[PDB]
Amino acid sequence: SMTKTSVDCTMYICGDSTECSNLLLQYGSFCTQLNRALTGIAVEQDKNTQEVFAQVKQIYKTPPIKDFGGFNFSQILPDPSKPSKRSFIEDLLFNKVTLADAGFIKQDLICAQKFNGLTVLPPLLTDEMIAQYTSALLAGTITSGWTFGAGAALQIPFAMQMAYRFNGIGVTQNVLYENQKLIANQFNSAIGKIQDSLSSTASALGKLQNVVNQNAQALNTLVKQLSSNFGAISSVLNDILSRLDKVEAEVQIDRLITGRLQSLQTYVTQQLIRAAEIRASANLAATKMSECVLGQSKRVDFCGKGYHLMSFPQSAPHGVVFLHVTYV
Amino acid sequence: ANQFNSAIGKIQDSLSSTASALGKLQNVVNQNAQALNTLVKQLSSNFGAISSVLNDILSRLDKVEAEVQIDRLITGRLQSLQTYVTQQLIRAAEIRASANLAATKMSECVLGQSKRVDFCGKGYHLMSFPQSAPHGVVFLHVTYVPAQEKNFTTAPAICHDGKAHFPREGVFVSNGTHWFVTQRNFYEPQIITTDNTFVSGNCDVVIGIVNNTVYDPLQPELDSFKEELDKYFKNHTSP
Amino acid sequence: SMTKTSVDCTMYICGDSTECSNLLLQYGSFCTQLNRALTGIAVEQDKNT
Amino acid sequence: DNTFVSGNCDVVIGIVNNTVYDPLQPELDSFKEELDKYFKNHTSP
Amino acid sequence: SQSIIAYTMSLGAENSVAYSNNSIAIPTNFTISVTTEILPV
Ligand SMILES: *[C@@H]1O[C@H](CO)[C@@H](O[C@@H]2O[C@H](CO)[C@@H](O[C@H]3O[C@H](CO)[C@@H](O)[C@H](O)[C@@H]3O)[C@H](O)[C@H]2NC(C)=O)[C@H](O)[C@H]1NC(C)=O
Ligand SMILES: *[C@@H]1O[C@H](CO)[C@@H](O[C@@H]2O[C@H](CO)[C@@H](O[C@H]3O[C@H](CO)[C@@H](O)[C@H](O)[C@@H]3O)[C@H](O)[C@H]2NC(C)=O)[C@H](O)[C@H]1NC(C)=O
Ligand SMILES: *[C@@H]1O[C@H](CO)[C@@H](O[C@@H]2O[C@H](CO)[C@@H](O[C@H]3O[C@H](CO)[C@@H](O)[C@H](O)[C@@H]3O)[C@H](O)[C@H]2NC(C)=O)[C@H](O)[C@H]1NC(C)=O
Ligand SMILES: *[C@@H]1O[C@H](CO[C@@H]2O[C@@H](C)[C@@H](O)[C@@H](O)[C@@H]2O)[C@@H](O[C@@H]2O[C@H](CO)[C@@H](O)[C@H](O)[C@H]2NC(C)=O)[C@H](O)[C@H]1NC(C)=O
Ligand SMILES: *[C@@H]1O[C@H](CO)[C@@H](O[C@@H]2O[C@H](CO)[C@@H](O)[C@H](O)[C@H]2NC(C)=O)[C@H](O)[C@H]1NC(C)=O
Ligand SMILES: *[C@@H]1O[C@H](CO)[C@@H](O[C@@H]2O[C@H](CO)[C@@H](O)[C@H](O)[C@H]2NC(C)=O)[C@H](O)[C@H]1NC(C)=O
Ligand SMILES: *[C@@H]1O[C@H](CO)[C@@H](O)[C@H](O)[C@H]1NC(C)=O
Ligand SMILES: *[C@@H]1O[C@H](CO)[C@@H](O)[C@H](O)[C@H]1NC(C)=O
Ligand SMILES: *[C@@H]1O[C@H](CO)[C@@H](O)[C@H](O)[C@H]1NC(C)=O
Numbered sequence: 001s002m003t004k005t006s007v008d009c010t011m012y013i014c015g016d017s018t019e020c021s022n023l024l025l026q027y028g029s030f031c032t033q034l035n036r037a038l039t040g041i042a043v044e045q046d047k048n049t050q051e052v053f054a055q056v057k058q059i060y061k062t063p064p065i066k067d068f069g070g071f072n073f074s075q076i077l078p079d080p081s082k083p084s085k086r087s088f089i090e091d092l093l094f095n096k097v098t099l100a101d102a103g104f105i106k107q108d109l110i111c112a113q114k115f116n117g118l119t120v121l122p123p124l125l126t127d128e129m130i131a132q133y134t135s136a137l138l139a140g141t142i143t144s145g146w147t148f149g150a151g152a153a154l155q156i157p158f159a160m161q162m163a164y165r166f167n168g169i170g171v172t173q174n175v176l177y178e179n180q181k182l183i184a185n186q187f188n189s190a191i192g193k194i195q196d197s198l199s200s201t202a203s204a205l206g207k208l209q210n211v212v213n214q215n216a217q218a219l220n221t222l223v224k225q226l227s228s229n230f231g232a233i234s235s236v237l238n239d240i241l242s243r244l245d246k247v248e249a250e251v252q253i254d255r256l257i258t259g260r261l262q263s264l265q266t267y268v269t270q271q272l273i274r275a276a277e278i279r280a281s282a283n284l285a286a287t288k289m290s291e292c293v294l295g296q297s298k299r300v301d302f303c304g305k306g307y308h309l310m311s312f313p314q315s316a317p318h319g320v321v322f323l324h325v326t327y328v
Numbered sequence: 329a330n331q332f333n334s335a336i337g338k339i340q341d342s343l344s345s346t347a348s349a350l351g352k353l354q355n356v357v358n359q360n361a362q363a364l365n366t367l368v369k370q371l372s373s374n375f376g377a378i379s380s381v382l383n384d385i386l387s388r389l390d391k392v393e394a395e396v397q398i399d400r401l402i403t404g405r406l407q408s409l410q411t412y413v414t415q416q417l418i419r420a421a422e423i424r425a426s427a428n429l430a431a432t433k434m435s436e437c438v439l440g441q442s443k444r445v446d447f448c449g450k451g452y453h454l455m456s457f458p459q460s461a462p463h464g465v466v467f468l469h470v471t472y473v474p475a476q477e478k479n480f481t482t483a484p485a486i487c488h489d490g491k492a493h494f495p496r497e498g499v500f501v502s503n504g505t506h507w508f509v510t511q512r513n514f515y516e517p518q519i520i521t522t523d524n525t526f527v528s529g530n531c532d533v534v535i536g537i538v539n540n541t542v543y544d545p546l547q548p549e550l551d552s553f554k555e556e557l558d559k560y561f562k563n564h565t566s567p
Numbered sequence: 568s569m570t571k572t573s574v575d576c577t578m579y580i581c582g583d584s585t586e587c588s589n590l591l592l593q594y595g596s597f598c599t600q601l602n603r604a605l606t607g608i609a610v611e612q613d614k615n616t
Numbered sequence: 617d618n619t620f621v622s623g624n625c626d627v628v629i630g631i632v633n634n635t636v637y638d639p640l641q642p643e644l645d646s647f648k649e650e651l652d653k654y655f656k657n658h659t660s661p
Numbered sequence: 662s663q664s665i666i667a668y669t670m671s672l673g674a675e676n677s678v679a680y681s682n683n684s685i686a687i688p689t690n691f692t693i694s695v696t697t698e699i700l701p702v
């Protein structure tokens with residue numbers, strides 16, 4: 001997803017001016033459509049979120065015994081001891097991105113945004129509920145293989161599922177069992193290298209961070225356009241109205257509407273186009289969830305580089321992460 | 329055949345009574361109709377000019393005064409069309425992405441048998457049938473879905489003769505007393521014959537292996553050949 | 568990938584004139600907004616390739 | 617068991633020679649020697 | 662006596678899969694299902 005926003009167009013242009021509102025009416029419904037177009041964007045952020053994460057209709061829980069044949073999901077399963085029931089790797093990913101607000105109770109860029117009718121809206125599914133769908137998607141996988149996608153959940157021993165997996169990559173099921181302790185240790189070592197990576201490096205989440213950075217910056221740009229003259233005698237609306245009479249104001253105010261209104265249509269164009277970038281990224285993420293997490297993929301390099309075994313999802317700010325597990 | 333006919337009955341009955349189903353195609357028709365209405369309603373906007381109507385400014389003003397008014401209505405109607413065309417260009421790319429998706433699903437689900445999970449609808453994919461719609465396509469996707477599961481003890485491999493044995497296709501299960509080999513996607517048990525199974529190495533290495541005898545279906549074909557033989561010998565002792 | 572493009576918004580709008588460039592300052596950040604829009608595309612043409 | 621057959625040995629460019637086992641063969645062979653022992657003992661009476 | 666109510670959404674039926682190191686579920690019967698899909702063209 002990207003950040004939800006809404007923009008009280010009449011506050012943005014005309015913050016507490018009856019005059020500016022009466023003149024803004026001369027351009028008919030331009031604000032209405034802008035409200036409707038940001039509404040179209042905002043509905044589809046929850047669609048995008050729900051398609052990626054609600055790919056199951058049951059909230060599967062792991063058994064309390066970790067009898068998984070040596071593989072150590074304790075770093076990707078729920079930590080019960082944290083109120084956010086996220087994994088080890090999730091709690092790294094949530095530290096790495098530092099969100100400029102999400103709508104968590106206002107009672108700084110975002111004070112200015114609020115005072116110009118720009119509001120960040122809360123997402124439909126909370127980071128806890130996303131972590132829960134993610135916990136279910138994972139807890140199904142390590143107990144039920146691909147079957148929990150294709151119908152009712154069917155239990156299977158994890159080492160037996162991995163045998164079928166190996167058949168999926170064109171490797172015969174004895175090869176797993178004759179090396180099972182090694183295969184567990186390599187998986188455990190690899191999960192350890194994702195931790196040791198993500199904890200250390202400052203460049204990893206650039207793909208998500210650049211989306212957030214643009215959302216922040218475009219709101220900051222749309223704020224900063226309020227400081228322009230557009231050739232009027234001030235950028236401050238009241239410094240016009242408290243200086244000039246009614247007739248002489250209408251020139252200056254029409255200049256500010258000519259500016260500000262183009263300032264919104266520009267942003268809402270940028271946001272729409274941006275939304276098409278994210279809608280594709282979400283439709284892809286839902287596809288990878290379907291085929292790599294609920295499945296095993298015979299598509300080359302589709303589920304990370306190498307012959308695909310399985311994938312584990314993890315949530316991140318405005319995003320998802322796929323731990324793709326592969327035989328090389 | 330009955331379950332398919334029945335589930336096509338369920339398709340008809342579904343779309344017979346409820347309005348909400350075609351809401352995707354209704355939303356494409358509604359946005360296109362909405363935007364044309366919204367564009368038309370901009371012909372009512374003043375843009376500060378003394379009318380919405382071009383011909384009234386030309387019914388009342390001369391060339392010197394009318395240009396200062398007409399240029400307003402030009403500026404604001406051009407901006408209304410620059411907006412509608414930016415919106416429709418953006419929307420049109422949503423429809424393009426959907427048209428590439430609808431062709432890709434035609435390609436792999438109707439002309440084929442997809443192995444992509446949850447692409448051609450839920451279940452394991454058997455086949456799909458296309459149907460037209462106003463500005464769309466409807467796929468009737470047909471899927472096999474497992475229904476009635478039974479708990480079994482299961483084993484990765486069997487030990488019969490120090491050698492470890494594995495299914496060539498399928499899995500081993502116990503009904504709680506006897507070991508059988510069966511296909512992974514449907515319970516149909518069979519005797520663990522040397523034809524259902526292949527061998528690799530010895531039973532020291534396989535974590536969670538067990539003990540169970542493996543039937544070589546050639547053995548009694550020769551042991552019946554041996555009792556056929558030993559009676560030909562008993563006979564031949566008589567003359 | 569398509570041709571990368573980038574624009575001097577002052578040289579397109581107000582080419583060889585300070586006089587126009589002053590009247591453009593009144594509109595503020597828009598030229599940099601356009602530049603970023605084009606610099607975004609231009610990075611993505613390398614990325615696509 | 618591992619292999620399937622088609623055609624005689626000319627048609628396959630880059631063909632080779634290697635003794636191919638039949639796991640049925642020594643099973644009928646060790647049975648031919650057991651049987652051979654039977655035959656012989658029936659000579660003794 | 663109908664009124665608008667507001668609630669924390671339930672996400673679906675909560676479950677615990679009957680996993681163990683030696684247990685499998687294999688299906689003895691199956692349903693053939695037909696699902697509609699609608700797309701813009
Ligand atoms: C586990 O699966 C086994 C195979 O289905 C099953 O054992 C089978 O039980 C039937 C009777 O219910 C036997 O049928 C035979 O019974 C006697 C044998 O002398 C005859 O009078 C009958 O004509 C018929 O031949 C099968 O012989 C028997 N098979 C085996 C391999 O023992 C078990 O009962 C199943 N276990 C459970 C707990 O259900
Ligand atoms: C599964 O079946 C196997 C074959 O019956 C069985 O193996 C047998 O285990 C016994 C007990 O350990 C061995 O008995 C000998 O143990 C040592 C030598 O290894 C000697 O010092 C003792 O005096 C005694 O003779 C058998 O030799 C051994 N044979 C084979 C071929 O394995 C397994 O124990 C069985 N496992 C289960 C889980 O039931
Ligand atoms: C691979 O093994 C084959 C079997 O040993 C072998 O074939 C044999 O080739 C020789 C030499 O050409 C033949 O010898 C006869 O050749 C003609 C008749 O074809 C006669 O006029 C000669 O006097 C001579 O008897 C064998 O008859 C032939 N037999 C068979 C069954 O193939 C191949 O030559 C070997 N190839 C390689 C690459 O080693
Ligand atoms: C498959 O078995 C599990 C549990 O294993 C069995 O549970 C005992 C009741 C008994 O049969 C033992 O020999 C086994 O160890 C079943 O899980 C139970 O499901 C019911 C609801 O249907 C629930 O009330 C119980 O608490 C569950 N028990 C446990 C231990 O998980 C499961 O339902 C069985 N599936 C089928 C299809 O029979
Ligand atoms: C799975 O690996 C984790 C480490 O990633 C193990 O958890 C650690 O256990 C040791 C010993 O009790 C503690 O000192 C650490 O503080 C634990 N780390 C964390 C992050 O919890 C866990 O024990 C391993 N599981 C198995 C079955 O060996
Ligand atoms: C598999 O399930 C089907 C139903 O989906 C079963 O068929 C029904 O069986 C009962 C009697 O057992 C009949 O009253 C119904 O009329 C049958 N329905 C149909 C569609 O024929 C079927 O018997 C089950 N088979 C197995 C092997 O479990
Ligand atoms: C399964 O694991 C338990 C310990 O959790 C062990 O006691 C039991 O013997 C194991 N059974 C098999 C078939 O591996
Ligand atoms: C035994 O072999 C003799 C020939 O040596 C034959 O005539 C007779 O029918 C055989 N009897 C049986 C029971 O096979
Ligand atoms: C392979 O190439 C070599 C030359 O390096 C040639 O002598 C030989 O006959 C070729 N064999 C086959 C089966 O192509």
Ligand SMILES: *[C@@H]1O[C@H](CO)[C@@H](O)[C@H](O)[C@H]1NC(C)=O
Nearest residue numbers: 653654656657658659660661
């Ligand atoms: C012949 O075989 C019998 C068993 O059928 C055996 O008792 C006897 O000792 C054998 N005699 C010889 C000479 O091999």
